[PDB]
Amino acid sequence: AAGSLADLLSDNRPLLKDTIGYLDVIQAPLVEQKQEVSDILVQMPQALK
Amino acid sequence: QVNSGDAIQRWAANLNTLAAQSAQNDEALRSGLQQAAPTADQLNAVFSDVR
Amino acid sequence: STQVNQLLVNAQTLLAAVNERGRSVSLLLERVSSVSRQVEGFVDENPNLNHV
Amino acid sequence: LVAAVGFGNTGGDIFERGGPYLVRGAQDLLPTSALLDEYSPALFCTIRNYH
Amino acid sequence: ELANALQDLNRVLKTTREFLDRNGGVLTHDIDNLEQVTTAILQPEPRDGL
């Protein structure tokens, strides 16, 4: 298990770093506009019906 | 005992090497035990939360 | 003396069972040091992980 | 030692229940990951134009 | 073999302790919320709807 974890980290450290950065940049507008997201999620089912 | 003399010489040298390495890192060993006491408790708490 | 004999024979049995998996046992220390270094590097190089 | 007992048991039960699921999920994610990677350029402009 | 192993074990124990103290509550909260939303959207009727 120690070897497997060390290998996984050594292989996926840069990709996980880039994924963390891109998740940050994706989620910053989502957080800054959370009220709009909540409102449209509340609004959609009645419109769909 | 005589038939294994090369074996006992080898494990004596290996024990000497291991003991010297452990003795030169006595403080690191102490700090390792001290920090190892609660980190497993932290990990158990985290896992039991997400169990 | 009986305790000494049983001690020696059980030590032989235990050591044989342990070093049967010699390939993994010999690499135990190297693997634990490597995973320690990898975890330390992963935590060190992503200081913005908490914000994410 | 006692903390290691607790941590090992808890982590072992967690992994026993949620290891096959992760393995087969990461197996089934390969085609859809390739699919989403192929249609990367049709994402930014599509979102911008719909906006 | 042993000196580096002990030193790196000490360092990784310290790093794991700090990382857990800093991120555990938020990580567990994220896992719980993800579980709740996915279980909500994988109910029978949402399943056949999807």
Q: Residue C29: its chain A contacts at CB < 8 A?
A: none
Question: In the C/E pair of chains, how many CB contacts fall below 8 A?
Answer: 34
Q: Residue B31: its chain E contacts at CB < 8 A?
A: 10
Token readout for D43 is 């994402």
Which residues, other chains included, contact A24 with Cβ-Cβ below 8 Å and sequence gap of 6+? C48, C51, C52
Token readout for D47 is 């979102």
CA distances from E29 to A29, E16, E35 (A): 21, 19, 10
Distance between CA atoms of A22 and A28, rounded to whole angstroms?
Answer: 10
Question: At CA E16, angle to CA E5 and CA D1, rounded to 5?
Answer: 70
**Could you please report the per-residue DSSP string of D1-51?**
-HHHHHHHHHHHHHHHHHSHHHHHHHHHHHHHHHHHHHTSHHHHHHHHHH-
CB contact under 8 A, E12 and C39: yes
Whether the CB of C41 is below 8 Å from some CB of chain E: the reply is: no
The closest of C32, B51, A7 to D12, measured between CA atoms, is: B51
E43 torsion bin: left (phi>0), alpha (psi -120 to 50), beta (else): beta
Distance between CA atoms of E46 and E40, rounded to whole angstroms?
Answer: 8
Distance between CA atoms of D17 and D6, rounded to whole angstroms?
Answer: 17
CB contact under 8 A, A27 and C52: yes
Q: What is the DSSP letter of E43?
A: S
> Residue B47 is nearest to which of D3, D4, D14, comparing CB atoms?
D14
CB contact under 8 A, D13 and B51: yes
CB contact under 8 A, C43 and E26: no
Whether the CB of B46 is below 8 Å from some CB of chain E: the reply is: yes
Own/partner pairs for C24-28, CB < 8 Å, 24+ apart? C27/A3, C28/A2
Distance between CA atoms of A43 and D31, rounded to whole angstroms?
Answer: 34
Own/partner pairs for D7-16, CB < 8 Å, 24+ apart? D7/B40, D7/B41, D7/B43, D7/B44, D7/B47, D10/B44, D10/B47, D10/B48, D10/B51, D11/B43, D11/B44, D11/B47, D13/B51, D14/B47, D14/B50, D14/B51
Q: What is the DSSP letter of E42?
A: T
Chain B residue with minimal CA distance to D4? B40
Identify each DSSP E strand in chain E by its residue range.
none
Distance between CA atoms of B48 and C51, rounded to whole angstroms?
Answer: 24
Residue ranges of alpha helices (H) inside chain B are 5-23, 26-49
Which residues, other chains included, contact C31 with Cβ-Cβ below 8 Å and sequence gap of 6+? A2, A3, A6
Distance between CA atoms of A45 and E40, rounded to whole angstroms?
Answer: 15
Distance between CA atoms of E43 and E31, rounded to whole angstroms?
Answer: 18
CB contact under 8 A, C29 and E1: yes
Token readout for E28 is 């567990």
Question: In the A/C pair of chains, how many CB contacts fall below 8 A?
Answer: 42
B37 three-class SS:
helix
**HSE, side-chain direction, 13 A CA sphere, residue A13:** 16
The answer to whether C29 and E1 are in contact (CB under 8 A) is yes
Q: Residue B39: its chain E contacts at CB < 8 A?
A: 13, 16-17, 20
Phi, psi of C46, rounded to the nearest 5 degrees:
-125, 70
CB contact under 8 A, C34 and A27: no
Token readout for D34 is 């390739």
Token readout for A43 is 């609004």
Whether the CB of C32 is below 8 Å from some CB of chain E: the reply is: yes
Distance between CA atoms of A16 and A24, rounded to whole angstroms?
Answer: 12
> Residue E2 is nearest to which of B18, B35, B50, comparing CB atoms?
B18
CB contact under 8 A, B43 and E20: yes
3-state secondary structure chain C: CHHHHHHHHHHHHHHHHHHCCHHHHHHHHHHHHHHHHHHHHHHHCCCCCCCC
3-state secondary structure A15-39: HHHHHHHHHHHHHHHHHHCHHHHHH
CA distances from A24 to B21, E27, E34 (A): 44, 15, 18
Distance between CA atoms of B19 and C18, rounded to whole angstroms?
Answer: 20
Other CB atoms within 10 A of residue C30 CB: 15
Other CB atoms within 10 A of residue B31 CB: 18
Token readout for B50 is 């997400």
Token readout for B47 is 């896992």
